Design a protein around this ligand. Structure first.
Ligand code: GBS
Ligand code: CA
Lengths: 129, 240
């Protein structure tokens, strides 16, 4: 069970339906992982985070993932990269579809062989390098 | 900052000076054009109201923060689990009335992601206008210094901080001292470079004295706070 500053059943965490009075179970379902900003989504069935495949991903999907993460209208970059998060399962996009995390399905591979690297804001750059 | 050096323009473009009554009080870190990460103890009552606060960006010298260069703060949000006694969960957010304009002098620092795989003694940087000596005055020029991460197990030793470092805290500095944050640096950034990107890993929170041996700096563990930060930012985006 996961608590939302009250715990909820795990299959109802990030299942598209709010169950916590404040909605904490449905508002932290997208996340950037590692120093390469690998886009990850929480799978309620597997109770784990999984990278998003580059297959059929576009800018407007990234912008919506950036909106879900709290970056509003901020968008910097999105490209496919080789997964370095050591994952074995992935979330592949179904086009026949709806919130970002409710549009994906479990896949053990990605056709493109790439995962989404998403940057919502141009940060972390100073004078050097 | 004790033991540091004066910062160059654009060296720390996310650093802001937070003012109350025309006087620097705390540091903060830009993460978006609207949002600043600072420390919750900076905004304890009576300074919890946003109208007291002005933020100055892209200016290195306190005497150069003229009337009209500041950005008026619109919202102050302390972490709901902040504890004044222990400084646990010492983080707060500040939203500006008008968004910053980003350029070579004013840019955000990146929020940390899970899976950064930092080294146990990762090389880090701190910056601010805090005193350059314990019990000293606010510094006129922005300073910065290199500090190493100190593993919490070592920091919680009987001879360092004796189990006072909670999972919402990290230690950085040198057990010999001589390089440390100090009064007026609190709320400011603890950043590290990885994958050619600067990440905000800590916000300057507290410590016993400044630059004293076996009393390093304690920083709010920004990684633990990212979920709360995202929720606040998304909730504000949906208007209030
Ligand atoms: C904040 O103003 C602040 C943070 C930390 C210290 N002490 C040490 N870093 N030892 C003083 C003041
Ligand atoms: Ca739910």
């Amino acid at each position: 069970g996961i608590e939302c500053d009250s715990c909820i059943n795990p299959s109802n965490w990030c299942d598209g339906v709010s169950h916590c009075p404040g909605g904490e179970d449905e508002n932290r379902c997208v996340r950037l992982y590692g120093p390469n900003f690998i886009l990850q989504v929480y799978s309620s069935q597997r109770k784990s985070w999984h990278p998003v495949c580059q297959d059929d991903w576009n800018e407007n999907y990234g912008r919506a993932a950036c909106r879900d993460m709290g970056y509003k209208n901020n968008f910097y970059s999105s490209q496919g990269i080789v997964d370095d998060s050591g994952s074995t399962s992935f979330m592949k996009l179904n086009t026949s579809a709806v919130d970002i995390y409710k549009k994906l399905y479990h896949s053990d591979a990605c056709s493109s062989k790439a995962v989404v690297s998403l940057r919502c804001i141009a940060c972390g750059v100073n004078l050097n390098d | 900052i004790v033991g540091g050096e004066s910062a160059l323009p654009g060296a720390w473009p996310w650093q802001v000076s937070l003012h109350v009554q025309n006087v620097h009080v705390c540091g903060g870190s830009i993460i978006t054009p609207e949002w600043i990460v600072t420390a919750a103890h900076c905004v304890e009552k009576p300074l919890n109201n946003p109208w007291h606060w002005t933020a100055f960006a892209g200016i290195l010298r306190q005497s150069f923060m003229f009337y009209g260069a500041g950005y008026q703060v619109e919202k102050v949000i302390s972490h709901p689990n902040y504890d004044s006694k222990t400084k646990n969960n010492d983080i707060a957010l500040m939203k500006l009335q008008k968004p910053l304009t980003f350029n070579d002098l004013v840019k955000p620092v990146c929020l940390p992601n899970p899976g950064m795989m930092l080294q146990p003694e990762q090389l880090c940087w701190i910056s601010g206008w805090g005193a350059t000596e314990e019990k000293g005055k606010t510094s006129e020029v922005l300073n910065a210094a290199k500090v190493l991460l100190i593993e919490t197990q070592r920091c919680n030793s009987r001879y360092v901080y004796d189990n006072l470092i909670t999972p919402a805290m990290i230690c950085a500095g040198f057990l010999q001292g001589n390089v440390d944050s100090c009064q007026g640096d609190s709320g400011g950034p603890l950043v590290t470079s990885k994958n050619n990107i600067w990440w905000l890993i800590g916000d300057t929170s507290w410590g016993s004295g400044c630059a004293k041996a076996y009393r390093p700096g304690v920083y709010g563990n920004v990684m633990v706070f990212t979920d709360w930060i995202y929720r606040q930012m998304r909730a504000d985006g949906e208007f209030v």
